[PDB]
Amino acid sequence: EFLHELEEKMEVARIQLQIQETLQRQYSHHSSVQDAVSQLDSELMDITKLYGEFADPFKLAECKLAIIHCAGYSDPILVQTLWQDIIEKELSDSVTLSSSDRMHALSLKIVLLGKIYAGTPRFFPLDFIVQFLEQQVCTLNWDVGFVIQTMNEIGVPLPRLLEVYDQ
């Protein structure tokens, strides 16, 4: 049970590290509001606190998603709604020439989050997600296998992908 507490801790701590890392990249932030980093490094935080305070205000959709994984929040609507935002945000930055470039970046973003969540079906509804991704990417140049390859890379098995896809 000691192990239980330790592992959960490692997970939550990791999230803060990720949030912390993103804060650096984010340009919405001000250096003087260093206070946030101090808070992040300073201690473990409540999940809700992390979610409500950090993820939503800084629109870190990926982090939010991962966090809810640990929480194990099942609610599909909320989970899906969060996914919609991530996808929508991605569209904003893109310009078109980088169809391929965005193609990679998009796959990159998805795979990373995908690796963390993919083990559980609630955040990563493979069935729901695949079409969603295709639909998103559809308004882009296409090469076949672009969508599925990401899931394979995500950590999804060939056998799992096959049955769902066939369905």
Partner: protein, 56 residues
């Protein structure tokens, strides 16, 4: 600066940043994070920030 490379960019200039970025990517005994990040900067620049490009 690997996490913010604007500062390098500002002082040094974009070209020089790219060059250094290339060296870090290639550079040996470097952490994967560093190499990947530098590769990313070299290849894509900063997303929705500094763009990497030929201009007429």
């Amino acid at each position: 600066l690997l996490v913010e490379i604007e500062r390098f960019f500002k002082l040094h200039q974009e070209d020089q940043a790219c060059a250094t970025c290339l060296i870090l990517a290639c550079s040996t005994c470097d952490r994967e994070v560093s190499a990947w990040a530098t590769r990313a900067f070299f290849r894509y620049g900063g997303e929705a920030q500094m763009r990497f490009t030929t201009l007429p």
